[PDB]
Scaffold this active site. Sequence first.
Site, short mmCIF file in Angstrom:
data_model
loop_
_atom_site.label_atom_id
_atom_site.label_comp_id
_atom_site.label_asym_id
_atom_site.label_seq_id
_atom_site.Cartn_x
_atom_site.Cartn_y
_atom_site.Cartn_z
N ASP A 1 50.71 -1.24 -10.57
CA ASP A 1 51.68 -0.26 -11.36
C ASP A 1 52.29 -0.18 -12.74
OD1 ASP A 1 53.05 -2.46 -10.88
OD2 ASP A 1 53.96 -1.39 -8.57
N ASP B 1 48.91 3.01 -1.19
CA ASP B 1 49.64 1.77 -0.55
C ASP B 1 50.94 1.69 -0.19
OD1 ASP B 1 50.78 3.28 -3.45
OD2 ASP B 1 52.45 1.27 -2.96
N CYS C 1 42.40 -4.37 18.27
CA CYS C 1 42.27 -5.46 17.14
C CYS C 1 40.97 -6.03 17.31
CB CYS C 1 43.54 -5.44 16.81
SG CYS C 1 43.68 -6.67 15.23
N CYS D 1 40.99 -8.26 14.53
CA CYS D 1 41.53 -9.32 13.26
C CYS D 1 41.70 -10.60 14.63
CB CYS D 1 43.20 -8.73 13.25
SG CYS D 1 43.99 -9.83 13.65
N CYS E 1 44.52 -11.78 16.92
CA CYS E 1 44.46 -11.03 18.23
C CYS E 1 43.20 -11.71 18.81
CB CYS E 1 44.74 -9.76 18.26
SG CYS E 1 45.89 -8.49 17.70
N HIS F 1 47.83 -9.66 11.50
CA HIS F 1 47.44 -8.32 11.99
C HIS F 1 48.23 -7.43 11.23
CE1 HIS F 1 47.25 -5.84 15.26
NE2 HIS F 1 48.59 -5.90 14.74
ZN LIG Z 1 45.54 -8.07 15.16
#
Ligand SMILES: [Zn+2]
Lengths: 364, 364
Positions: free
Chosen positions: B92, B261, B299, B301, B304, B330
């Site tokens: 930015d 963003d 999820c 990830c 998880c 997460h």
């Molecule tokens: Zn997750």
Amino acid sequence: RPRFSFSIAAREGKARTGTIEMKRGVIRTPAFMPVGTAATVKALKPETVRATGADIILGNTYHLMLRPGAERIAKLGGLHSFMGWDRPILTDSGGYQVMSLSTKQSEEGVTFKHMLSPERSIEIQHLLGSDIVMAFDECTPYPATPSRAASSMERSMRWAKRSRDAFDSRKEQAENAALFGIQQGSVFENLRQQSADALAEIGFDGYAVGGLAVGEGQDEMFRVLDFSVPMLPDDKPHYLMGVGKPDDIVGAVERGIDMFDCVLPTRSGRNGQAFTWDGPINIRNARFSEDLKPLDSECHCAVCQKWSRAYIHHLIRAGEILGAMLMTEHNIAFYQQLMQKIRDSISEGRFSQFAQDFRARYFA
Amino acid sequence: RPRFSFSIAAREGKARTGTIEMKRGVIRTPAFMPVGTAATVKALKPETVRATGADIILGNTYHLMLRPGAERIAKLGGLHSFMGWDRPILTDSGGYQVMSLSTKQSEEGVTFKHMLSPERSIEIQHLLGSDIVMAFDECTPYPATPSRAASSMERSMRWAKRSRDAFDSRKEQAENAALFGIQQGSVFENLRQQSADALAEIGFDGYAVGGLAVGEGQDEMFRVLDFSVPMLPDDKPHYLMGVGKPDDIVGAVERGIDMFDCVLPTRSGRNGQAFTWDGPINIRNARFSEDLKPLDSECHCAVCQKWSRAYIHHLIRAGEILGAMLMTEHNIAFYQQLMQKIRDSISEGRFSQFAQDFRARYFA
Ligand SMILES: [Zn+2]
Ligand SMILES: O=c1[nH]cnc2cc3nc(NCCN4CCOCC4)[nH]c3cc12
Ligand SMILES: O=c1[nH]cnc2cc3nc(NCCN4CCOCC4)[nH]c3cc12
Ligand SMILES: [Zn+2]
């Protein structure tokens, strides 16, 4: 495969190196245990703790028995599953921090603002699913009169027997875990001997030296270790509780200690202190603001492979979580590399030279 | 290999999906950029940010230009090397936070407690080694009178031309980086049109919609996007600054936005809010204390795959750093999975159905 098997592969003077085989993994000794305070080694995923070389961690019981509580952790599948660490965990008894963080003392146990007894401590550690269980004891304050040290030690020995009985009564615990006793006696040789005799009579899988690192200083600690460690059974692991700085560890190994735990690498890490082979540095110091070198020039850790002192300096000064993460990973890795060098040098019969070389450079 | 090449692979209504190729990597659009506040995406190593699926991060300039300073970061090898992120970084201009965190405004630029001008902003971003450079603008406060919005927008357009000239004057920047302009005009259609015309006349690699997510609310934001995005060149990326919640993102993509963003996934993560396909949850809530399910049932990830709600609940309530780490990983992964589902559904011509299905479940 085995519940608990300690094998000594090599010796140099009083120093030993070897392995403890347990159901959840092998522990290379001399060993350093990173401390998990409330079911986490602060600022590290368990995979990162393992990546640094740790074989076993210490789980503080005191905080866990309050929140989430031992029964709750058991309902959730035990401490290993809860925090995601599948290797051995040694749990403390909970009593040390009761005295330092809460109290009413009696022969039954300790009341605090709950009652903690040898039997309750063993049950809590069982519920957590501990691999190495510590007997419930009393860490005698320092200094202590010989009479006060004696009565304190004697109570600890009675509690050690009660810990043994409670552990043995729980079949699943007796079959899958190990139990360590804790020697007391303050700085007094005769009391240390009486304590060792009592513990050996009862019989434990390992023996801790308690009552030290409580303000006595390194000279006095080493003096007490000089006579105290040889009193313990030679064929079982020797665990020095709450020690310590790198030089403390080296000197304790020279005196027969096989296992250590300390919050220093984690706590220091968060506070900006990094351990290096040339001694500790404070990364917040302005002299590191443009230093492109890693925290330590030889360190094999992921942090030193990738980031500069300058960057970590910036992170810690900014109060950034990543600063705590990187400092902690490096410090724990440094401690593990120290233990590896200790193990290799004993194995190779050059530990004395290592100790001398280490101290000359570390304190230069 | 190329400096900046935007290719649109598929469309559905106003929504687009495609890629931006840059020297440091490919950016899949629509894209979400995790925010790096002071040269770190809070509580995540760069490798973890990448593991979640992020192709590009946003680097706040305001904090960095103060500490360590842009010249210092350049001396240390640039922002990429400094923080260990080797992929594209959008920086930015520094001006937005000057107005919100520090001020004296003039045609030259902004003075604050230092002077920040279009020329100085571009030079700072050059020193950082930014891949996508934002023109220095003025985010008109909301609400604004038409006259105030007009004079503000006009100043931003003059600053956009100065940003363009400063960027073009720096050969290495012009050859290796890209420059985005920022549309202003508050909520007024005629001013938004004048702003778009001015920016297109100058010519940029991408076009941001500025002046939104400043208190106007989703209905009004969407209303303004409805007419504002079609004014921008169709063949260049469209970037909505500072947006937003998952539903904000889906609606903005439906209106032609390609890039986003927001600090929400990181900031919320630290505060105990986890995003799930059934809406956000606050992990501190007592209802999660014994919940063995992962944060989100679908999820993909790492968090998880390994840890329960119950454990993360415990960590966050205990103020543990690992709690912030896991929640943040997460949430950023959830945002990236949202973007992936958006990209796939547009590619497959089923984005409308996805948006409807997403909203029905998220707000159930
Ligand atoms: Zn997750
Ligand atoms: O007799 C003991 N019995 C059961 N637990 C202990 C724990 C112990 N912890 C220390 N010392 C800790 C030293 N730390 C160094 C780093 O900063 C915090 C204190 N000494 C200890 C002795 C005992
Ligand atoms: O016109 C703009 N020009 C240059 N930078 C911007 C940044 C901007 N950021 C927001 N909104 C941020 C909304 N956040 C949501 C999460 O909580 C913090 C605020 N709106 C923005 C507009 C502009
Ligand atoms: Zn290191």
